[PDB]
Amino acid sequence: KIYPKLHQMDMDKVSRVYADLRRESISTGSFPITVRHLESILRIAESFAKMRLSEFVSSYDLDRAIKVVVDSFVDAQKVSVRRQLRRSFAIY
Amino acid sequence: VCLLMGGSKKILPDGMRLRGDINVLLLGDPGTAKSQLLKFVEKVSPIA
Amino acid sequence: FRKISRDRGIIDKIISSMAPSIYGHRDIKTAVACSLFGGVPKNVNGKHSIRGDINVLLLGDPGTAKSQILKYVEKTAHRAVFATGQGASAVGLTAS
Amino acid sequence: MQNQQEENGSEISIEKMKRYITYCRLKCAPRLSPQAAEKLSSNFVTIR
Ligand SMILES: Nc1ncnc2c1ncn2[C@@H]1O[C@H](COP(=O)(O)OP(=O)(O)OP(=O)(O)O)[C@@H](O)[C@H]1O
Ligand SMILES: Nc1ncnc2c1ncn2[C@@H]1O[C@H](COP(=O)(O)OP(=O)(O)O)[C@@H](O)[C@H]1O
Ligand SMILES: [Mg+2]
Ligand SMILES: [Mg+2]
Questions:
Q1: Which of C20, B47, A35, A22 is nearest to D21 (CA)?
Q2: In a mutagenesis test of the B interface, which of A30, A34, A37, A39 is the best target, namely the one with the most B β-carbons within 10 Å?
């Protein structure tokens, strides 16, 4: 019965987060970042929201989701690239 | 758009058969959305 | 249900109620919870589909209890099926 | 923004389009104009 919603007041943050993770990925010379990563971000945010039987995807859920994708990408990389990125992405 | 309409089929009196159909290749990086284009062309064509 | 849903931090309770007999590995348990709840499938005017389920791959060294988590998921879920790549199982992956 | 401009003649639908393509396919066969053939012929040589 729980089909959570995506009211777009919360679009400004993710645009600029994706922009930064794209600009950083090419500079460091590693896996490319495509929009499938952002689709995963939103689809995981849906699950974190549905956990609270919620009615409007929160920003807390988006922030919890962001860690999963960023950590996966950072931890699936070579040692040198990984040391670069684990410092660059410290804020998320 | 041009693909789904195909060229004009021509049968000649030499037994020879000049085809009419269109072939396109989508070569490129990952995550360019070229797969969704195929999945839509599946559904917008009468036989696919 | 609704009462437990109002307690702030239901997320970390769920994440620690998962495989309740394997030590540590919080990230995999978080991913298990995410893929065991799901999401929303989408059709944009019957011409564009974005899936809802989230896939999870495990890559690990011998002796890290991956099969134990796979066993737990099958006792916890409604519609779950088990198949093996190189072994003897009651169901295959190909239609016939 | 699709279900709205759809009803303003700035978009065909998915079954309507399908029917239209079937129609034009199983209706006509274009044969080119001779006033244009030499254009395509000169183009090919300048290309090669
Ligand atoms: N982190 C862990 N916590 C608890 N038990 C563990 C842990 N890692 C391994 N074990 C235990 O060690 C054994 C490992 O067997 P298991 O088949 O689950 O490992 P596996 O990684 O799936 O196997 P393999 O990769 O070699 O095929 C089991 O008894 C499992 O419960
Ligand atoms: N330009 C775009 N506009 C809309 N959606 C896009 C765009 N680029 C990517 N996507 C989305 O991101 C994903 C891209 O992956 P996919 O279509 O499988 O591409 P590829 O063919 O490169 O593997 C899809 O889910 C698609 O809907
Ligand atoms: Mg593809
Ligand atoms: Mg095993």
A1: B47
A2: A34
